[PDB]
Every structure is written in structure tokens, then in C-alpha cells.
Amino acid sequence: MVLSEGEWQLVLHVWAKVEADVAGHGQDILIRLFKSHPETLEKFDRFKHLKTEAEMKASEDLKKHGVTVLTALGAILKKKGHHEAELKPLAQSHATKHKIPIKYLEFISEAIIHVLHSRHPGNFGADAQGAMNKALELFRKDIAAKYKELGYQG
Ligand code: HEM
């Protein structure tokens, strides 16, 4: 699939707001993912012991990881589709080391959309959400294809 420049503009415009508070957005997103789909927490041996949302909010470690996730995703989005180099090491670690099924990438995509909708209503109308969903679908499709080449296609 291919996004138009207009679609990328909508995506990068709301992402510029996200970048005003990367740690806060990273936290909200990972917590939303863990509350909505608790099974995903089992993949993080580093966080698997967090029992409540209160514990999650208090975790400095979870917060640092959220920053790592959003910084990596932001670097990919800013490439506007030319992200093959950035995708390679990410696909390799998630397919071979962490073993993250595509289904879980759909779950985090949903969490990202939920949080942007909640925090940025004025910059995340229907068209902007459609563009963000298209950018994340492209990301998932490309990661899925890499998974297959790497022998996982999980
Ligand atoms: C927007 C999608 C995601 C991005 C951009 C992303 C990015 C990253 C980055 C950059 C790292 C550190 C380097 C590495 O190991 O590759 C990482 C580690 C990891 N990721 Fe992801 N990730 C994503 C989704 C997921 C999902 C949905 C899961 C699990 C349900 C997951 C589980 C893990 C685990 C288990 C680690 C290692 C954490 C640790 O022990 O330090 N990732 N991810």
C-alpha cells in the first residue's frame, strides 16, 4: 500500500504533538495495551510482575521502555514509507528473540489510536485517524513480510 503525502501530513502533524511528551504518551500506550490485552504482558519478563495500573504507572522501567518504543516508531513514521533499514533489526528481534505475534502488533496499534484519540481530539479527527491507521497497517504489513523471510511469520 502507499500513503499519499496528505495522509503522511496528518500523521506527522499529530505525531509532533506526541513528541511534546514522549514519556507520558509511552506510558499511556503501554498501560492501555496491558489493561486491554493482559496476555501481552506475559511477553515482558521485565514487567510480568506488575499487578495493577498503579504499579505500572509507578514503574520507571516501563516508562523508559515506552520512550524506547515511541522513539523507534517515530523514526519509522518520519521515513514516510521508506523504512526498510529501520524495520530490519526490529523484525529480527521481535521475531527471533521476543517472539511477538502480528496479532500483538495489532493490539498495540489499537492502543496507540485510543490514546491519540483521547489526548488530541482536535488533531485526531476521522481523517487523521484513518491516516494513522493506514500508516500502522503499512508498518504491520511490512513487518509481517519480514517475519516470513526470517522464518517466523508469527
Ligand atoms: C509499535 C510497535 C513496537 C515497537 C516500535 C517496538 C520497539 C521495540 C524496541 C525498539 C525495543 C528494544 C530493542 C529490541 O529488542 O528490538 C523493543 C523491545 C521489546 N519489545 Fe517491542 N516494540 C513494539 C511492539 C512490541 C509488542 C506489541 C510487544 C509485546 C506484546 C513487544 C515486546 C518487546 C519485548 C519483550 C522487548 C524486550 C524488552 C526488554 O526486556 O527490555 N514489542 N521493542
- For residues 129 and 7, the answer to whether their CB atoms sit within 8 Å is no
Phi and psi torsions of 112, nearest 5°: -65, -45
Q: How far apart are CA 94 and CA 152, in angstroms?
A: 10
DSSP 36-70: H-GGGGGG-TTTTT--SHHHHHH-HHHHHHHHHHH
Ligand 1 atom at shortest distance from the alpha carbon of 45: 40
Say how many domains are in the chain. 1
CATH of the domain at 79: 1.10.490.10
105 CB-side CA count, 13 A: 24
Find the helix packing angle between 5-18 and 60-77, rounded to 10°.
160
Q: CA angle, 135 as apex, 94 and 48 as ends, to 5°?
A: 35
From residue 87, give the alpha-carbon distance in Å to each of 4, 25, 58, 91. 20, 22, 31, 6
Question: Would you say 143 and 105 are in contact if contact means Cβ atoms under 8 Å apart?
Answer: yes
Q: What is the CA radius of gyration of the chain?
A: 15
Q: 115 CA distance to ligand 1 centroid (A)?
A: 18
Q: Which residues, judged by CB distance below 6 Å to any ligand atom, belong to the binding site of ligand 1?
A: 40, 43-44, 46, 68-69, 72-73, 90, 93-94, 98, 100, 104-105, 108
Instruction: Output the residue whose Cα is nearest ligand 1's atom 22.
Output: 69
Give the resolution value in Å: 1.5
Residue 92 structural domain? 1-154
Task: Return the residue whose CA atom lies nearest to atom 8 of ligand 1.
Answer: 69
DSSP-derived 3-state class of residue 152: coil
